[model samples]
Target: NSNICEVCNKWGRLFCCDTCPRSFHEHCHIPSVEANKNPWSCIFCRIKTIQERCPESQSGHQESEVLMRQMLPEEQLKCEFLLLKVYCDSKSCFFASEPYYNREGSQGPQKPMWLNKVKTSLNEQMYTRVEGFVQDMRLIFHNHKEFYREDKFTRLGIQVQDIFEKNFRNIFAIQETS
Candidate 1:
């Protein structure tokens, strides 16, 4: 029901959330909604939608079922990079040369797909994209600073630079060694 506007606290032109009991002045919301949309929800309502879709909140469902929910692709990619950072922080083997050695040979298998995307982007000279990921990495660290070590982030940065330069030279067939 369209009751008192949450923002202005007056009964003026308001947008009422169809999904929940929240309502707001037409221009008082952080982001105003158009009047013609069929199913519009307020910010809190959308957040509620996401929370309900979260795998941890849903009971008796497979993990993959939750993963297949409505996740934004770009955010999913960012999450993958952040996950990679977490894994590297825990493993401390982001640059391990022989981490995958076995009876087969030295280059046993490809690294994780996210790392492969990093390698490919660097090799293809996509600095802006990689830099964006690095920036997001820093933001991730900023939010979880207590969980990360400064030295580990420094190490990861150095390893990324080294990988980028190495892959760039390999891709360009540069004869000069750094």
Candidate 2:
């Protein structure tokens, strides 16, 4: 199932949201998830509350901070957290629905395109900043189009990428950057 509790990363028993890809621990969420919370909405999905802002970084993750500033823990995690859900949702649709993707996994590239790889890269905190994450997400779409050769699934990839970009812009509220 590839279910990991999104907040704590401790995966024993998790509350799964059927509508999205994330499963979270009850205690880890705001408004506290309760029993029989089936078919639930995730914090990433419905967004019931606003996060408390944190202080800007004094020193850490130099490659990030200031796209135009120190990336405070809140801002840093803000990108990671939001982008994390994007992967789960995108891959949840891409991988979960497409059996052909797995069965014909013989297509070889030095860096083969797969959402799981993107999932690992982002969630593992491998990138220095959100922009680095953004680059990788773009690569997946590029790779998909190249690998699938503009076929139906690649067409599906376009729609998925559109949703990805929409959330990304809304997440960062960026409008046309260099």
Candidate 3:
């Protein structure tokens, strides 16, 4: 049945697949050319021989059935119920200390892990605490600006002094007096 190949468009001259313009010579498909007519050119016939169904394709459904049967119910359940808590203690600290404090407030349990009951309370105290602390620090620095108004060295010292005093006062204002 060596008709014109769909690929090469050659008549009986062994031109194989219509895709590649090559001829299906005697040795083109199985049953080697040496065994059959070596000079043979049967394009359509060669394509028919080459077009056998793939073994893997034919058996794929059965293979998948076998694989599904091999898995246990518990193994399937293990994949489904896997739990993970994405803890963000550091990010909570930064966010709670920075932006949220700048805006509305600490809305959740976004407290640092190392905070004890009092420190934890302080952290959870939210925007009021954050805003007040920042404000008071501004006031302390404002007080010291006069101390170092002219001298660079004095300015540096006064700035550091203001920062320490403000931070300490704000951080322990509630507890220190208690």
Candidate 4:
């Protein structure tokens, strides 16, 4: 519904999502919503559909479903996708490198956090619950905002945080279950 790709503002032959007022380049999306799937759906629509049901508010669909288990595949995808989206922000690189550990954990926060740490933790499947991963992501941005103290970097951190939070809500339809 716009002139450019939502993820990377560059223009190209775009894929228009049938369900949402959004457009994307095939590569910009995780699953490559391609030409053949042109009329299928964008990730946002698909995710919304997938998470349309939740255990906490189940009314028994009387047809089909699956257990949420420790995590759903969609949950994992959203985690990885969210962090990578943060990485795409140009200023966030300041928070990712090994040097960011305050000379190997000397002068930073007592429990230091960096984007790279969370990335690797995700790669190793270290988070048993999605909340754990979400917690770490919040910590990374929290450190950024705290350390930078509302400068450009702090603004960038919140920008990334907003993106993550919005998508996290969109994907999980999240509400406090307990």
TM-score of each: 0.32, 0.52, 0.18, 0.54
Each prediction's Cα lDDT score?
0.44, 0.55, 0.30, 0.64
RMSD values, in order shown: 18.5, 9.2, 32.5, 6.8
lDDT of 2 by residue, 69-90 (tens): 3344444555554555554453
Best by TM-score: 4
The C-alpha stretches of model 3 lying farther than 4 A from their native spots are 1-127, 157-178
Model 4 Cα lDDT, one tens digit per residue, 115-169: 7788778767787767677777788777766666635656877887887776555
The predicted structure with the larger lDDT, 1 or 2, is 2
Model 1 stretches astray by more than 4 angstroms: 55-178
Model 1, 73-148: lDDT tens digits are 4333333333333332322234322223333222333332234443344334444443444443343223222222
Range of the 10 consecutive residues with the lowest summed lDDT in candidate 3: 79-88
Between candidates 1 and 3, the lDDT winner = 1
- Which candidate order results from sorting by TM-score in descending order? 4, 2, 1, 3
What pairs collide in candidate 2? 66-69
Tens digits of lDDT, candidate 3, 59-97: 222322332332233222211111000011122121122
On the 0 to 100 scale, the lDDT of residue 142 in model 2 is: 68
Better of 3 and 4 by lDDT: 4
Clashes of 4: 0
Answer with 1 or 4, whichever has the higher TM-score: 4
Better structure of 2 and 3 per lDDT: 2
